């Protein structure tokens, strides 16, 4: 059962103001392929596929993806069509810095000058991350990428070439995407690149410390963006015009019960599933749940970067896409973490106290709908950090491959329907008073998913395998052209 | 799945008044046996089961039951066991009156007296129903029962005859027991004595009309009430001491989805669930949405009847066991009604727009544990119908023979569990200005559960049918007897 | 008594967004005179006062009214003067299709060219209603107008005739004006042309139905405008930048006194008042309440129709005067309706439960000014109705000829203040969310008020029928001005 | 400057409930006397003052005190004298039990039976703390008093001999007072007896550890406090008319400036100062934060531990005096822990964000006036905690010696202003829900204030030391007899 949106209840462009964003996003790695082409050097998700293949539910990877190294002139004139004043995209910065780091390589740099020329002939607006997951595996080689320091310098060199080649044009940046997402898959359950986790665990280099290594490199990951920022307003942002932030993964959270320990719970898996990397950029240090239930585990920040670190945003981005209710775990000796995620001590379950589910499932089995959990991630925004400026930087669906209930892949109405709940939730919050400046919907195009592959559709727009990787518009995609009076 | 409240959410007696009443509920029928001793003629359920056995799930009938008849002061005494102030337990017409009319039978009488004596002598106070569903066989067969006007002279006659037998002990009653739950299930699914439907469905008697004699019998009933009242106060409360009223049988409502239809449906449903008995006895006639709905089919008052009618409660009996969604029918060439229910056009749904069950299933398949429905029905008694003095006459739920994750009868945590969330939400109600007077659980002891014969066990205090009907304290019972400070 | 706003309370144009438009309004039939210049053929109105002109007050027609046929120049003129920025004007059917189907007249076609490049010419907008009760007596007398399902294709033609020759400069369009006070006025107490009514009730033509011609008048206007709408949604709005509507009568209600019937009495007044047209275009369906009180005489849409009606406007019109009280009226044998607003079950009372009249009246016995109902309206159009795009079309009172305390036809400082405490009722819909985007007075200038004839003055602007129809500013005219800061 | 209630807002007994319990407290080290009379042995505090003389500011000592011992007969007539209806005192345990275990002393017994059959005499309602800091010596020098499991059992047979002896007469008690100041004062800062501190910390007894002595004694009260509540259940209160619970210390909370880490530092305080033993009679465990924040310095409890806590207070005693902001303080390696209190990582401060003081001075250096702080710990009870019965069992302020604004003893209008606002405090929670059932100014009569001996009087009744220790009402309790209409 799928109940949709009443027709008086449909968004109308007219909701938001005109200053407001609408657009779409995307990642290097999941859409652009051509992997090894003109000089690219490896990333680790290049390797990651490359060496543990069937870490890919349905057998694939990104070699080829929707080959917008080639074809992203198409991607620019869906965006055209659907009227979407914004697209976010990534840099590879495999493909700019083959090694990592020193020389940089012309055809990688031409290739984003021609995306970002072509979207603005189209009047169309560039939001681009930085660094999307896609680590140059000559860095992971030399040092363990950003399990050690010298990253910091490193993603700050890479940094400094986006903005020389960019900035000219590219007035909006996200440092980092996901790095809560990033650390906890990567470093913690390994199911992600580099695919380290501890002794015993199954992911495809059991050797690490799910305990440990993701703490260390979410704290380089903050070092970096500190760096990179403090360059930024340094020494590219002479006309004051240009703004830099980061973007985190979040999920709604409400109490599994009616009882105010699973308030608390509540309180510690805000804290570690958006506090841990928003909490540094607004007052230089982690969470306090966090360093009390970490300790030594969670590495401690100088002065000095606690500073850098305070106030480093101009805009924040919060890619939303699902909630869960929060129960309480006691500590005590019967119970000790396995993975970073256990040090909240709170379980993320799927269904409450009454047994009922949060909300119906879109399609993939984690994204269940409760747009109502990101109107209340939009206040805390709002009544706890200072109301900063707030761009939803990805939300969407997945419609998965053989799925009896979405035979015809351009139907999407169950996504159209969610993203409109979605939109008019972002409208509820602006209502009350939360600063939300844009929503851009994951998904422009369907694109690798990760540990997914393929099998997981995203898009609005519909990418023919079968045919040539052709761009074909959903009717989601059909819907935002009417929405956006194309 | 099933959450129980945690530690410091238990009700206490302290939360209540000193005045607030605690009790159990049964209904002759249901417990007595006996069926044909000392000259007790037969009712419209012996007749019944007699001549529809089938038409009880488990195969049984109520020729013997708990075997109060005999048993009584046991059921005395567990009700003294747990501390109940209530008992609130209805009288035999049949027994009373073999015939319906005319000579009353003695021995009938005095066992009343007995149970009414003994209760006193135990601190115990009787709340009466005169009338619960149990109508003598001799009237139905002369004249259809109540689907004519005489049963409302003789229902006056055997009510005067209830006042001067224990009017001088019996200071609180009830005309009629469910009147809605009654029409329906006896005139329109005809799934309960007499029995009776439209031609072409299936219940024992095909031979009436769904959409015309539940409200014929419902029209009788409240002509019945309203003349037993007038008598009552006339002649039969010369202490002014002295209350009545009746009790209806209401589920809580939802709106199915956000909409202002399903507003608009929930409404309707409320009508035709509570308004359909309580309308009348507050304003004279039925509501509104009734009326518009049903025409012709739903009879006119006279003014005198009116009159009679309105204000014609002392105090109102709630019976509360669940909730549903209510979900908005439009009113079209493609739609006719076919039972009853139909006519107010929103169906009632155990689940909501977002596929969730309202609340957790108790055991038997219709009663799903949602105490806000209960709070809400009564601030809609306190702000629509003038805050009456209400009491909860029924509240319980059942445990299903066989069902395995209820293996042992007397371990009742989950019926605890519920009743003490009910408890708890007419506390809420009360804190908020709802006059609620008293909580009188169903299930004083196991019972015959109508269509569902005995498999559905309702009962604080467990019947053992292998050990000759003895009466065993449940742990809900036990609970009490420690809330009630035995 | 007559007590005005206190000076800190008189709206200032700062109190609304620079987007928000200010205009007067006007209907072909009302000023144009020429009734039978240029080929105009004769409407409805014509016909109505030509045969019955014992139905206007004072014995006048529409044969010249205001002459703005000849001098709208002079229209556009005074709306300069004022600052207005939006005209509200109507388009004669029987001007611009004489028979009305068939061959355009070009002289009629010129007219509204010559004031629509006037109006543009010194920047103001036109807002264009194109039914205004104007009907061509032509179809009236080939199959009885409204009455008949071939208006329905009529319509279309004649909708398209006016986007064809003026959509390239008009963008904002209202199909119809004011259904409800049409079908309850034309052939409910058949006042209004053509003036029908059934057998014993006093009209010009008492040989209708007031319990059926209304109803299905009103339903072929809701099919004429699906199709219209539908057309134009198609083939006349390729840039995307045009809306269409359609405008509502509606009046405020309050419950006659404290009691849930007289809250469920309001409602049914609102639903019949408003939600007869403004429901079938939000969801493709009469209210629930209509259709379950009118049954068989309120036609049925079929779903193809249901799903043309829903969505179907980009703006929606109110025009709005007065409140009244809403008193419950009980069904039953006693009462049958006679009026199709009899059907409500709701009497519109000028005086509450205190004997208090609802508010001040300001001239014509009908208008008391009463800004909170507005208010009010405005939020069920937020909180129920999914808060649509609104401007107030029509809003203003009239002088009434003769009245002593209106010796000065200029001095209309009572209309100003009534104005100025709807601007202010509209400001506060607005802080409360309400999404209202312009307001138009009713009362461009002094018109032919149906009816009333001249006897009634709407204007802002006099007509000095004793010195040749000239403009002369009121003293609310000369108050736009300096609010409009001209 | 000092300002008083106005006189309109003085309160009256007219606003609480018949059955609200106004009484005062002493404890029997503070007022006894005698400690070496009729058998008694020795107590920590009567080794602490003849070893550490010095640790009493004042040179004074508990040896004759109020020499209640001889005098009670005047203390009850004290409060006879107000109208007082309660009397809470405690029970010496080394007066009835001289070494702690083994033979009970007779004549210790039957001073607690004098006092209490004269109380009862009176119409005074005893309310019994049994332990009140007053641990016996032998058990001290046996095996380190509370610092060992073995005063667990010891404490158990304490109370029995308390419930055998005057359980037929006293209904309600209190197991433990103040358990925080205990551990706080006696095993942290060690200014009370026994004096125990960290080596290098100033104590009489520098060879405890401020960081472990004060969480292992807590722990053992909470296990003793759970063996004899069990024990009283299961023998003690056969008739359920007895009611037993523990008294504890709290200070409200308010955050130091505006900012959520400060909103965080408050919860923490809370649950530091009230939560370590509140929540574990609520729930079975410490406040999550405390566990958190101290690890393997806070004792696990078992699970038939957590049963035998969880719900173990009929009644919750509530010690207020004042309150403090609450200041954030960082978990960084800068910072280690020297007292238990460093443990809430929340310093008190007695100044706001502005510099502004929380409240008025009343004399001795701690208590500053802030009723509004009880209020809200009140209603986090009723919100957060299950609204459990309340009794202020401790109110009050002291007067110092020497304090030139307070020369005449007697003249105590501070105190009575201050106690005036606080009762109005408790009037305002029950207003709005809270369940407080009595008030008890601490100070019946002047006494040994511990660590500042007599040089703090916090009586309503003057005790002369010039005088013979006679007994005098001072202006508040000459109040408090017309406030209780002697």
Redesign the interface.
Same mark, same amino acid.
């Given at each position: @059962?799928? %109940?949709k949106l009443?027709?008086?209840?449909?968004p109308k462009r007219?909701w938001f103001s005109k200053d407001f964003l609408f657009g779409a996003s995307t990642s290097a790695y999941q859409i652009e392929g051509a992997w090894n082409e003109d000089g690219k050097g490896p990333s680790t998700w290049d390797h990651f596929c490359h060496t543990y293949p069937e870490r890919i539910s349905d057998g694939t990877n990104g070699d080829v993806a929707a080959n917008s190294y080639h074809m992203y002139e198409e991607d620019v004139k869906a965006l055209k069509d659907m009227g979407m004043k914004v697209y976010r995209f990534s840099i590879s910065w495999s493909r700019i810095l083959p090694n990592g780091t020193g020389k940089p390589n012309q055809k990688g740099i031409d290739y984003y000058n021609n995306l970002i020329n072509s979207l603005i002939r189209h009047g169309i607006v560039p939001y681009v991350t930085i660094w999307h997951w896609d680590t140059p595996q000559a860095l992971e080689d030399k040092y363990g990428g950003f399990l050690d320091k010298q990253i910091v310098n490193d993603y700050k060199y890479f940094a400094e070439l986006c903005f020389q080649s960019f900035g000219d044009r590219v007035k909006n940046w996200f440092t980092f995407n996901e790095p809560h997402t990033y650390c906890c898959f990567s470093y913690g359950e390994g199911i992600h690149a580099p695919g380290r986790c501890s002794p015993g665990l199954d992911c495809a280099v059991p050797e690490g410390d799910s305990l440990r290594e993701p703490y260390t490199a979410g704290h380089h990951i903050l070092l970096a963006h500190a760096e990179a920022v403090e360059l930024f307003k340094a020494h590219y942002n002479k006309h004051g015009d240009s703004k830099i932030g980061m973007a985190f993964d979040v999920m709604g959270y409400e109490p599994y019960?009616? /009882?105010?320990?699973d308030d608390?719970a509540r309180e510690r898996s805000i804290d570690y599933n958006m506090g841990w990397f928003l909490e540094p950029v607004v007052?230089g240090?982690y969470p306090?749940?966090m360093? /009390?239930?970490i300790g030594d585990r969670l590495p401690?920040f100088t002065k000095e970067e606690q500073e850098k670190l305070a106030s480093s945003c101009d805009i924040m981005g919060l890619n939303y896409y699902t909630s869960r209710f929060s129960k309480?775990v006691?500590?005590?000796?019967d119970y000790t973490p396995t993975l970073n995620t256990d040090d909240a #001590?709170a379980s993320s379950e799927t %269904?409450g /106290?009454?047994?009922?589910?949060i909300?119906?499932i879109t399609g993939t089995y984690w994204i269940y709908?409760y747009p109502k959990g990101l109107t209340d991630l939009l206040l805390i925004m709002k009544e706890? #950090?200072g109301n900063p400026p707030i761009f939803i930087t990805e939300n969407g669906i997945a419609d998965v491959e053989g799925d009896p209930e979405m035979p015809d892949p351009l139907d999407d109405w169950k996504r159209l329907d969610y993203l409109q709940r979605h939109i008019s939730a972002v409208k509820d919050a602006i209502?009350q008073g939360a600063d939300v400046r844009g929503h851009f919907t994951w998904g422009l195009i369907d694109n690798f998913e990760w540990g997914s592959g393929y099998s997981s559709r995203f898009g609005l727009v519909y990418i023919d395998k079968e045919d040539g990787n052709k761009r074909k518009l959903k009717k989601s995609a059909k819907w935002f052209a009417k929405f956006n /009076? @194309?």
């Open positions: @059962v799928f %109940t009443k027709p008086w209840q449909i007219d019960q009616d /009882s105010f320990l608390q007052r240090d306090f749940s360093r /009390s239930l401690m309480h006691d500590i005590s000796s #001590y %269904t /106290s009454d047994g009922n589910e909300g119906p709908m706890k #950090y209502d /009076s @194309v």
